[PDB]
Amino acid sequence: GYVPAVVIGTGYGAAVSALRLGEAGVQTLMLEMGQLWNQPGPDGNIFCGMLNPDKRSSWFKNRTEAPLGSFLWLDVVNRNIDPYAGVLDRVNYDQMSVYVGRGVGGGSLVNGGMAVEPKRSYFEEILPRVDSSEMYDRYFPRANSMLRVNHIDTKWFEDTEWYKFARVSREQAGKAGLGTVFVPNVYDFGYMQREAAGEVPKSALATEVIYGNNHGKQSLDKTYLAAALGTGKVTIQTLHQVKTIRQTKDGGYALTVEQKDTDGKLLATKEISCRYLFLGAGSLGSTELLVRARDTGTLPNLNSEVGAGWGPNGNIMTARANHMWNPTGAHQSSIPALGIDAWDNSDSSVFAEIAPMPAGLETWVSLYLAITKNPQRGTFVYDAATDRAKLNWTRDQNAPAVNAAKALFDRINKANGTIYRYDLFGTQLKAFADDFCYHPLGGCVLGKATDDYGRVAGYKNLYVTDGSLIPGSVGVLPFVTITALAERNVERIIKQDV
Numbered sequence: 001g002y003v004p005a006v007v008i009g010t011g012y013g014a015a016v017s018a019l020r021l022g023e024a025g026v027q028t029l030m031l032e033m034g035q036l037w038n039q040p041g042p043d044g045n046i047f048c049g050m051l052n053p054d055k056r057s058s059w060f061k062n063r064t065e066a067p068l069g070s071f072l073w074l075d076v077v078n079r080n081i082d083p084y085a086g087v088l089d090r091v092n093y094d095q096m097s098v099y100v101g102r103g104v105g106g107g108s109l110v111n112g113g114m115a116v117e118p119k120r121s122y123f124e125e126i127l128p129r130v131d132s133s134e135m136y137d138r139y140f141p142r143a144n145s146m147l148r149v150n151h152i153d154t155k156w157f158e159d160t161e162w163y164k165f166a167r168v169s170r171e172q173a174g175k176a177g178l179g180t181v182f183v184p185n186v187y188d189f190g191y192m193q194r195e196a197a198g199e200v201p202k203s204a205l206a207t208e209v210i211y212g213n214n215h216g217k218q219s220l221d222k223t224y225l226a227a228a229l230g231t232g233k234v235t236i237q238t239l240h241q242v243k244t245i246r247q248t249k250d251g252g253y254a255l256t257v258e259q260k261d262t263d264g265k266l267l268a269t270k271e272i273s274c275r276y277l278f279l280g281a282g283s284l285g286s287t288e289l290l291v292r293a294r295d296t297g298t299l300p301n302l303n304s305e306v307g308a309g310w311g312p313n314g315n316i317m318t319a320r321a322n323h324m325w326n327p328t329g330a331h332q333s334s335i336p337a338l339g340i341d342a343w344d345n346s347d348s349s350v351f352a353e354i355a356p357m358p359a360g361l362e363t364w365v366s367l368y369l370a371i372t373k374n375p376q377r378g379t380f381v382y383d384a385a386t387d388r389a390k391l392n393w394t395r396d397q398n399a400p401a402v403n404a405a406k407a408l409f410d411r412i413n414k415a416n417g418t419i420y421r422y423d424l425f426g427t428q429l430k431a432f433a434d435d436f437c438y439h440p441l442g443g444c445v446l447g448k449a450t451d452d453y454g455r456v457a458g459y460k461n462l463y464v465t466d467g468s469l470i471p472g473s474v475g476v477l478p479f480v481t482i483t484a485l486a487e488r489n490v491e492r493i494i495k496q497d498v
């Protein structure tokens, strides 16, 4: 049928947009291709954990996979599975694998909950056309509060076995003159203290994160989307994937939408039309829809910047072997609490998450997800033969990211007399994983493919709201930036356009 506003997807940009539209009295339909994660599964839990992956762990794969960094210990629990509408999608491109959430809440279902604002001077570097005082004075605070960001108790952190891994890396970095920072989170840290005391069901302390948290993590279905539904003006239809977008003869937008079951069988194809269309399908999904629409002629006025400017937030994974006297613990909370902040906006910049490992025995390994400043960008190019947007990114384009991560961790190895691990990512000696991404940024960059509020160039009442807006890098964990940017954008759009 027809509904005044449609939002595609239910991640960060989508959830902020639909809440504010509903509060403005605009009837709003969200279309999500994944599930509403609320049905107990065969173990009585909604989500599977990392030591017992099953079909819920994976979007249409026929075998489970180990979390990156942990194949040596967790391959033993991998199993063949039926392709199913599970929660984590590894999207393979030619020389890059991008990991994204699939379900009501998008990546908030599978991420580490880490909520960090970017460095103001870096924000000003990457988005010079955006007024940074309103961002820091109004929209970042608004996002932190609605997201339910909270802070770990420092005495509990210092004492608990569950964060020994973090303290070991803090000590080791400290000998190289590098400091750490506490990272705020949407995982309830009071709940986490109660897990460790045996008082409530464990989640972070029971090796859950990347296939969802059965407790503790305030994902978007609990914060923005719950509020959006509370407005009485928002509905969410799941297992509905938007395939094409066109501008209707009489105005507005029309969508073809496929409804599938959790086995991926096509149940129905529907046409849905609207006056205002908001894309929050993610860096990959929103960019694919628009490149497809441009190159198949359904949104012929889209510009040449649609598709461009993609980068993996400089993501590189690496690991260090600790001395035998520095064990990292068999019990590691699955929610990171500390990062190494060596980000000064120069090309040597690194902000590195001190990542837990789920093996559950002592391995002496310290794992890091480094965020780096690498100018290289890729482009999504539409392939009409398979009807897919392919990412034009090559592995050598991550050499600057690898070099910055290695120069930082080389300092730590030099100060401590330690070496890298070389065997965590595959048979060949490879200390740096350079062909994955958890933080895809770009494809519909703010001010290039769109105006400075995400209005798609060439079109009226057509908006992009999510990580595709960000120009490839934010120098920290990205979802607080995506949320705040979306707060700024939908407020303006409702005021001037709706």
Ligand SMILES: Cc1cc2nc3c(=O)[nH]c(=O)nc-3n(C[C@H](O)[C@H](O)[C@H](O)COP(=O)(O)OP(=O)(O)OC[C@H]3O[C@@H](n4cnc5c(N)ncnc54)[C@H](O)[C@@H]3O)c2cc1C
Pocket (backbone or CB within 6 Å): 008, 009, 010, 011, 012, 013, 014, 031, 032, 033, 034, 099, 100, 101, 102, 103, 104, 105, 106, 107, 108, 110, 111, 112, 113, 114, 115, 116, 210, 240, 241, 242, 243, 280, 281, 282, 283, 285, 286, 289, 438, 439, 440, 466, 467, 468, 477, 478, 479, 480, 482
């Ligand atoms: C393992 C991992 C850990 C991470 N840890 C952190 C962290 O701790 N902190 C942080 O800041 N960031 C983290 N990230 C990154 C963060 O999750 C993403 O940056 C964020 O979710 C991106 O939000 P978004 O709104 O752009 O899109 P997404 O959250 O990706 O949401 C897009 C939604 O649109 C749906 N969709 C896509 N295409 C269609 C279509 N055609 N029709 C219908 N629905 C559609 C998708 O199914 C999904 O639900 C993590 C990511 C991963 C994978």
